[PDB]
Amino acid sequence: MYVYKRDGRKEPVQFDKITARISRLCYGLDPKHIDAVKVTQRIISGVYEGVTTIELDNLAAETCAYMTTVHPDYATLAARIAISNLHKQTTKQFSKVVEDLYRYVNAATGKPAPMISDDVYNIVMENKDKLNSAIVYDRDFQYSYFGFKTLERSYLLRINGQVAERPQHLIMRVALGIHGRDIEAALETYNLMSLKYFTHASPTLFNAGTPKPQMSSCFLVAMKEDSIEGIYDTLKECALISKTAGGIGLHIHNIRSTGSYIAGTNGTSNGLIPMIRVFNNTARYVDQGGNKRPGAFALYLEPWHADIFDFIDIRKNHGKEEIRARDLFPALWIPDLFMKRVEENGTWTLFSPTSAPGLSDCYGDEFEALYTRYEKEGRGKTIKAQKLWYSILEAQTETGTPFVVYKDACNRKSNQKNLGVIKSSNLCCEIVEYSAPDETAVCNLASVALPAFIETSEDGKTSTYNFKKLHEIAKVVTRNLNRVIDRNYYPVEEARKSNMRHRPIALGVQGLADTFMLLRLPFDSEEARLLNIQIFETIYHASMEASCELAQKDGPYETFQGSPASQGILQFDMWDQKPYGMWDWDTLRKDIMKHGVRNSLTMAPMPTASTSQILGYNECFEPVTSNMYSFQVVNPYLLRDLVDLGIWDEGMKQYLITQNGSIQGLPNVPQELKDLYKTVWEISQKTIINMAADRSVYIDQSHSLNLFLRAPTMGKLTSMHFYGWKKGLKTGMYYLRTQ
Amino acid sequence: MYVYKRDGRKEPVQFDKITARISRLCYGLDPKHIDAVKVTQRIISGVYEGVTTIELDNLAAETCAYMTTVHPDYATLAARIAISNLHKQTTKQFSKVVEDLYRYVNAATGKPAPMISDDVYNIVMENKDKLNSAIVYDRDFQYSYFGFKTLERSYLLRINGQVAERPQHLIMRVALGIHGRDIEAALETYNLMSLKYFTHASPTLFNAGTPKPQMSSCFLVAMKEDSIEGIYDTLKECALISKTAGGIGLHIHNIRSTGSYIAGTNGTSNGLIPMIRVFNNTARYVDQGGNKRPGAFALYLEPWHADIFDFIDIRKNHGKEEIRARDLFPALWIPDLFMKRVEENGTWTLFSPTSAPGLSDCYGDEFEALYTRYEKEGRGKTIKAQKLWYSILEAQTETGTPFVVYKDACNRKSNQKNLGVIKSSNLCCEIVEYSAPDETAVCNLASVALPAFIETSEDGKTSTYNFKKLHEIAKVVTRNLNRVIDRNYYPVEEARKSNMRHRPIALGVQGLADTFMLLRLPFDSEEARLLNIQIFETIYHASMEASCELAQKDGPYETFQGSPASQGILQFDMWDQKPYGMWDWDTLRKDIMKHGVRNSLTMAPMPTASTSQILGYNECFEPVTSNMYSFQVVNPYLLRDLVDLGIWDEGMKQYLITQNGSIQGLPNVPQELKDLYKTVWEISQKTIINMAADRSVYIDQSHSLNLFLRAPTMGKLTSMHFYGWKKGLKTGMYYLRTQ
């Protein structure tokens, strides 16, 4: 045989070299069952004679995979082939790669187009090899190559159809795309970005220093008036906030339903769904940046609507094709009176929206004094309390929509009740921010991995989590995120209008099913409760004293005369509760009353759309949806843990291709390898609660958390939504994946 | 027999006390055949028991209609009943009707609703003693049943389930808010309105001096720019312009096709296909400000578009879910270069609009040495010309659409050569104006009733048709509209600034069929050609000397100079044809020169199907579409002459609940009556190119022109779509009804 190298010649195929390519990259791996012999003996056979080495390395980045069927020491062996292919077409450095891209003249016509900024470009004409002598190109291969089958895919920007970028330049332009002239607090962003401590979210790695920078993550767009005029100033807005990306979560509680009297020529406005299709034809045209991610829009209604029955069974597939709008995601905002209508059992009004002005408004004790008189007069129709509930949950049993939410609690314990009550959330059910005709509150997010602060204690034997590092790293981020609300070139004026005001933010985690299964504390017992409070109680102390120091100097977040932070109050204290105590809470409360804070809303964790992915950690604060991912992926903490006690050779390989992540039924697993790796289908959702009431108290904003089932009944939904409000959950139901 | 009265007393229908209210109402129409003895019985028989004489007319008044089974005197008889029956619940008074709609305490929430502006209302109070004192209530009983049944339907202002204005009240309420304060020009209107001389625009019936006096029917809403910036504009520009009513013929000749290079996002937009349906859910939804009459626009386009195939058959049902639009009229704007390139045969480039745009702004000979500039280098692709021409005559073979209106003909010969290149015709193909970024040129429709002039010529045996007074009738209307152009209310910046400017206006004709079949004249011969010429030599001259003298008093229009009119030129002299001679074109020509004209455009003969029926005439310059209609109807002049040479019966009548209003076969039918009562599917399609040219030389704008033929084989739509351009017709096609 002959091989065609990087030029166009012919290699007599060797066997000590194709795995001197390998037995010298079979490294640090504990190879008790892993060898370079068992490898090229299933590749050489399927090698073409009309396909280049890159196109040969194609099969390998796919072939080294066929071997994780026994031990997790083949992924970084199929990762050392893929990321190695991009080390080819464009040489190693961060300068040249980021060089002939700025001077970029196209094939079609002939005009130089600056792909990249003048910003993250003119802090490198003088500082270039402090950024190539502190950049170790080994950390091009500590990324799990699915995070790189996201990086090649598109994340590493391209030229003439060439992924000229490696991962080590997928981490550094985000250092002086944020900090820049302060190059000093800039590399400290990269430092931990190529170590997996935390990776920045979906959009913060998109355009981090190109010509006209938009870097805010989740928009809370506002509608500006019911009728012909003030609806053309939101039709274009979410559209504009979908040409330059950005998921949205719109609010409507005062637009005239299919019954309301007309303010002109007379007739009737056709209601709520001849709306979710014009906007849907907009929710279905502007592919967020022409052919990128298409546009996704959350929407927020309430049961008191005359067309609350037009809006719930929406994401359903049947029921014609004109009143069903399939891509404008619905979300709840339920009045907590409709709820204390459901359990006692009674009745519930559904006004025709010109029938109640500032009913698009009332909250808590003021909604139980602005609805008590709106029915002793009958300004709509009052339908049952457990029958709309039977169309709320049935919208959820074909589809999943909507997402159960309460209106009072999003301003009760939430930090906004001063500039205007919080009307809208975002695309993802956690950002609790106020929106108006002039005010549009934006958000910037990132994902902090928790399998990145775990270390071996000082007698081998035992190991408690490392609290300092999830804190001394989370200080870097509140200085990473005080340069992102900043350099944001906003597409119009709205996005700008109310992001330079409050400057709100959302911080979370990525690798909870990496940490428990890692810290040798099972996913469901006591050692689980005594670890999740002190992972966020530290974050609410790791991102609020580095915002507490950011008011001595620059000047506070413009509106502070009234916000809880300066009256002996924070968040968890609004939660009828106290703190843990290890962190300095008798002095940090104090730390903000004389000087202040630069941030407003902070703690808001995320499931990470296109982000935990990359880091090779399990998404957000969730375990395993399934242990066999796709194709195939063997759950690794269930392959590092089932090849030693006498339980690996072949057989159980069928124990999961149909069993649906079911190590609940397995033989040679006694009782300490069944509980910790409980698949989400067979773990109880009653007790994902008692620790989320211990992980929602220190949350300025809100949080998005799924509800799971294996055999669906709506009384399980009268004992799963029914267990997320008496405690007082920040969201009743995110999504729902049935069976 | 019982028929409880409209009030409360117990009345009986007899044999000559409920037909004597009808034998006293038996004036002006023949009694030879019509006897008030043949029928009452058969309705009195159909009379059941359980309804007041408020509703004793429902069948009774509808029945004399079913009696046009003999003569056209049961028709204008059927109404004489019902008019005497709306005359019931109503309190006629012109100052108790206008003292119940002004002070109109809407017990629907609290707020009254205006139906008149704060000008026209007060024009009634001090006038009532000579404005409740010239209203003859014989002419209330002189309108045809179907002219009424369109008014009682939706036109008239209806209050609490009770209609407001009787005909004359409206015919005069269209006189106190046009001319505003001129009352001796308020009588001037009503007379000739109530004297069968003419009828105003579409909206001058719906909104004459009303809350928002919107009096313009035809719109020309233009596409602004090539991204969200200028697209969500024409969107808000076809929305307020349509909240308060008015169809559109949008031109879209500067937006990039399927596959081009976007404004600055870096990718590809799908083109004109997932584009026209963002607009759709505004056409369908907003039924002219909700539940009135929704939107369907005439989308004008030019052939060089790379989306002119994903378009022309848009109105075909049988194909797919999204691609077609079944409720938005497609339209064309063909260059003088397309029609010269399907004769000898070759090819044509369909360009992309960031490659070869601006031909949308070229014409005539700005095309023939400027299109041969984009093609002879190859700036698109060169696809065949006997295939697109086929998918037009496929859309015309199925749908009917599109409407053919040429461009490099609607640009080279008019009276506005000082504002720009004409890019679009309206919804109706009868307006030729300048529409640009915010220069939305407008038009209020109108159409002169031609018949009533036929006088008791000076013996009673040989009649006359009049141009003498038709002239001066085509004079007082061009006053009416200059008072209408003005007392308006426009919804955006666009629709205004190009209306006080050019001041273009829309006049037409209706009842053209009534006249021929009347005057011993058919629709074809020399007894018919030379006629449709001196009728429009007395209208165009008048309307354009009912504004030549409003350049003395009111003043000329800002951009009149440069226009042919200021140069010893007009229309029939731009069509390069000899003057007729009966009218003054050496002095009117010598008095526009020195003085000017207030209006640029007067001529624009719409389909007049927004006006024709309320009177009784036919849908503009077209003849009859079936000598038998629906509620069946049989040609009345046909039905009158049936008792002359004695062929009126029932055995050759069951020959017209049959033949579909066609007359070509019967053994015995006289020569000039064979000739007299022909259908529309039965005459040739050659000479409608000679007389339309004998009716477009005295016509400045375009005219809406359908084409009817039973057979659509393409080796026939050949030297039958050509002649309508080699001579030089404007709108070279409007509608292709096969059927």
Q: What is the 3-state secondary structure (H, E, C) of A468-486?
A: CHHHHCHHHHHHHCCCCCC
CA distance A178 to A59: 38
Cross-strand bridge partners of residue B405: B333
Other beta carbons within 10 Å of A378: 11
| Nearest residue in chain A measured CA to CA from B240 | A228
Q: Which two tokens mark B543?
A: 């309307």
The dihedral sign for the CA sequence B365, B369, B370, B371: positive
Residues of A in Cβ contact (< 8 Å) with B228: 236, 239-240, 243, 286
B280 to chain A, any CB pair closer than 8 A? The answer is: yes
Can you list the alpha helix ranges (DSSP code H) found in B438-570?
Answer: 468-480, 494-497, 512-516, 526-529, 531-534, 540-543
| Nearest residue in chain A measured CA to CA from B236 | A232
B161 to chain A, any CB pair closer than 8 A? The answer is: no
CA neighbours closer than 13 Å in the CB half-sphere of residue B302 = 32
Judge whether B437 is annotated as a binding position: no
B261/A235 touch (CB, cutoff 8 Å), yes or no: no
Cα of first residue to Cα of last residue in chain A, in angstroms, is 51
A284 to chain B, any CB pair closer than 8 A? The answer is: yes
Alpha carbon of A370 to those of A340, A363, A407, B639: distances in Å? 15, 9, 14, 70
CA distance A718 to A735: 16
The side-by-side arrangement of strands in the sheet containing B299-301 is: B299-301, B330-334, B403-406
Q: Which two tokens mark B8?
A: 């409360």
Q: Which two tokens mark B72?
A: 């056209």
Q: Which two tokens mark B53?
A: 């004489």
Alpha carbon of B173 to those of A185, A238, B97, B142, B462: distances in Å? 77, 45, 12, 19, 38
A239 to chain B, any CB pair closer than 8 A? The answer is: yes
CA distance B501 to B488: 15
Residue in B236, B243, B321 closest to A264 by CB: B243
**Which residues, 6 or more positions from B230, have their beta carbon under 8 angstroms from its beta carbon?**
B223, B224
Question: How far B264 CA sits from the closest chain A CA (Å)?
Answer: 9
B228 to chain A, any CB pair closer than 8 A? The answer is: yes
CA neighbours closer than 13 Å in the CB half-sphere of residue B504 = 30
CA distance A462 to A478: 32
Question: How far B563 CA sits from the closest chain A CA (Å)?
Answer: 37
Cross-strand bridge partners of residue A433: A424
Residues of B in Cβ contact (< 8 Å) with A351: none
Which of A93-100's residues contact partners 24+ apart within 8 Å by CB, and which partners? A93/A132, A94/A128, A94/A131, A94/A132, A94/A135, A94/A168, A94/A169, A94/A172, A95/A124, A95/A128, A95/A129, A95/A132, A97/A164, A97/A165, A97/A166, A97/A169, A98/A124, A98/A169, A98/A173, A100/A159
Q: Which domains does chain B have, with CATH numbers?
A: 90-739 (3.20.70.20)
CA distance A442 to A249: 11
Which among A255, A281, A355 is the top mutation candidate for probing chain B, defined by the most B β-carbons within 10 Å of its own β-carbon?
A: A281
Q: Could you tell me how many CB contacts below 8 A there are between chain A and chain B?
A: 91
Tell me if B516 sits within 8 A of B672, measured CB to CB.
Answer: no
Other beta carbons within 10 Å of B171: 22
**Which residues, 6 or more positions from A75, have their beta carbon under 8 angstroms from its beta carbon?**
A64, A65, A68, A144, A145, A616, A636
**Burial degree of B485 (CB within 10 A; 0-12, 13-18, 19+):** buried
CA distance A298 to A246: 11
Q: Which two tokens mark A396?
A: 């959820």
Binding residues of A for ATP, by number, are 5-6, 11-17, 53, 57
**Burial degree of A347 (CB within 10 A; 0-12, 13-18, 19+):** exposed
Residues of B in Cβ contact (< 8 Å) with A261: 108-109
Say what the resolution is, in angstroms: 6.6
**Which residues, 6 or more positions from B167, have their beta carbon under 8 angstroms from its beta carbon?**
B139, B140, B143, B148, B151, B194
Alpha carbon of B44 to those of A322, B10, B60: distances in Å? 49, 17, 9
**Which residues, 6 or more positions from A140, have their beta carbon under 8 angstroms from its beta carbon?**
A83, A87, A166, A167, A168
Question: How far B288 CA sits from the closest chain A CA (Å)?
Answer: 8
Residues of A in Cβ contact (< 8 Å) with B285: 270, 274-275, 278
CA dihedral of B606, B612, B617, B619, whole degrees rounded to 10: 40
Cross-strand bridge partners of residue B331: B300, B403
Cross-strand bridge partners of residue A137: none
CA distance B299 to B425: 9
The side-by-side arrangement of strands in the sheet containing A248-251 is: A248-251, A297-300, A330-331
CA A130 to chain CA centroid, Å, is 32
313-342 in chain A: CB under 8 A from chain B? 321
Phi, psi (deg, nearest 5) at residue A189:
-80, -45
Binding residues of A for dTTP, by number, are 226-228, 243, 256, 263-264
CA distance B633 to B412: 45
Q: Which residues of B are catalytic?
A: 426, 428, 430
Alpha carbon of B283 to those of B314, B491, B494: distances in Å? 15, 17, 19
Q: Which residue has the tokens 């014989």?
A: B138
Residues of B in Cβ contact (< 8 Å) with A206: none
Residue in A232, A267, A291 closest to B232 by CB: A232
Judge whether B15 is annotated as a binding position: yes
A243/B261 touch (CB, cutoff 8 Å), yes or no: no
B266 to chain A, any CB pair closer than 8 A? The answer is: yes
Provide the 8-state DSSP code for A261.
P
CA distance A181 to A122: 9
**Burial degree of A582 (CB within 10 A; 0-12, 13-18, 19+):** exposed
A281/B285 touch (CB, cutoff 8 Å), yes or no: no
CA distance A673 to B213: 79
Q: Which two tokens mark B155?
A: 């036109």
β pairing state of A445-448 and A198-200: antiparallel
Which among B159, B207, B288, B291 is the top mutation candidate for probing chain A, defined by the most A β-carbons within 10 Å of its own β-carbon?
A: B291
Residues of B in Cβ contact (< 8 Å) with A244: 265
Question: How far B109 CA sits from the closest chain A CA (Å)?
Answer: 10
Alpha carbon of A553 to those of A43, A548, A556, A590, B471: distances in Å? 62, 11, 9, 18, 84
Q: Which residues of A are catalytic?
A: 426, 428, 430
CA distance A547 to A541: 10
CA dihedral of A268, A271, A275, A276, whole degrees rounded to 10: -160
Provide the 8-state DSSP code for A636.
G
Tell me if A443 sits within 8 A of A434, measured CB to CB.
Answer: no
**Which residues, 6 or more positions from B506, have their beta carbon under 8 angstroms from its beta carbon?**
B201, B217, B218, B430, B431, B443, B444, B445, B446, B601, B602, B604, B606, B701
Alpha carbon of A349 to those of A255, A308, A364, B139, B558: distances in Å? 17, 11, 17, 53, 59
CA distance A431 to A702: 6
- Helix or strand run (H / E) with residue A39: helix A37-40
Phi, psi (deg, nearest 5) at residue A395:
-60, -25
Q: Which residue has the tokens 């413009």?
A: A558
Provide the 8-state DSSP code for B155.
I
Residues of A in Cβ contact (< 8 Å) with B268: 290-291
**Which residues, 6 or more positions from B276, have their beta carbon under 8 angstroms from its beta carbon?**
B299, B325, B328
Residue in A244, A265, A278 closest to B292 by CB: A265
A236 to chain B, any CB pair closer than 8 A? The answer is: yes
Which among B111, B233, B236 is the top mutation candidate for probing chain A, defined by the most A β-carbons within 10 Å of its own β-carbon?
A: B236
Residue in A270, A282, A321 closest to B278 by CB: A282
CA distance B471 to B563: 24
Tell me if A471 sits within 8 A of A542, measured CB to CB.
Answer: yes
CA neighbours closer than 13 Å in the CB half-sphere of residue A202 = 16
CA distance B734 to B739: 16
Residue in A243, A277, A284 closest to B228 by CB: A243
